[PDB]
Amino acid sequence: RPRQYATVSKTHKTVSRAYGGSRCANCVKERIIRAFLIEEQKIVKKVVKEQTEAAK
């Protein structure tokens, strides 16, 4: 029950991962991969602006 969580230790309320007790594993998996690939792809989004805008 929602106020019983206070009486208990932290290892019952949390699993060890980042975004541990709030999101589940698979979802966390997705928000690493997306959070990698987009902020790798955005790197490509700057190598286009250095070549299209310069060789215009």
Binding site: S16, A18, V28, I32, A35, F36, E40
Partner: protein, 135 residues
């Protein structure tokens, strides 16, 4: 044609170190005696150094630049490999199968790995490997 070489940066997606950047120090495509799957021994950081500015005092700089590393066997399915690299041959000869069981040797390895990551963070080559994968 083989991009899991022993210098590649990877990102651990599973485990307690999820979202934390490692480098492969030794891959194993066939596996091993135990671990019946393609695994790789990696070493990465657990606490990122914080954004030190112009106006931090020197001692309060150094407590920012502490780095907590870790060595770990990780399956290939739990790593994103990436195009970034890191020179590994300083602590290549430390992290091995013998570095494990008798875990007192693990802290001896973490000493070497921490010293290597601080000596690379000073003279700040590899800026992306030490920046927080903000996810």
């Amino acid at each position: 044609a083989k991009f899991l070489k022993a210098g590649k940066v990877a990102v651990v997606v599973r485990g307690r170190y999820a979202g934390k950047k490692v480098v492969i120090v030794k891959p194993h495509d066939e596996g091993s005696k135990s671990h019946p799957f393609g695994h790789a021994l990696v070493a990465g950081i657990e606490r990122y150094p914080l954004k030190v500015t112009k106006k931090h005092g020197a001692k309060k700089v150094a407590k920012r630049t502490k780095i907590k590393p870790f060595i770990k066997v990780v399956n290939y399915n739990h790593l994103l490999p990436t195009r970034y690299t890191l020179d590994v041959e300083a602590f290549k000869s430390v992290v091995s199968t013998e570095t494990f069981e008798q875990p007192s040797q693990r802290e001896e390895a973490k000493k070497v790995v921490k010293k290597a990551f601080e000596e690379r963070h000073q003279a700040g080559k590899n800026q992306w490997f030490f920046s927080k994968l903000r996810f």
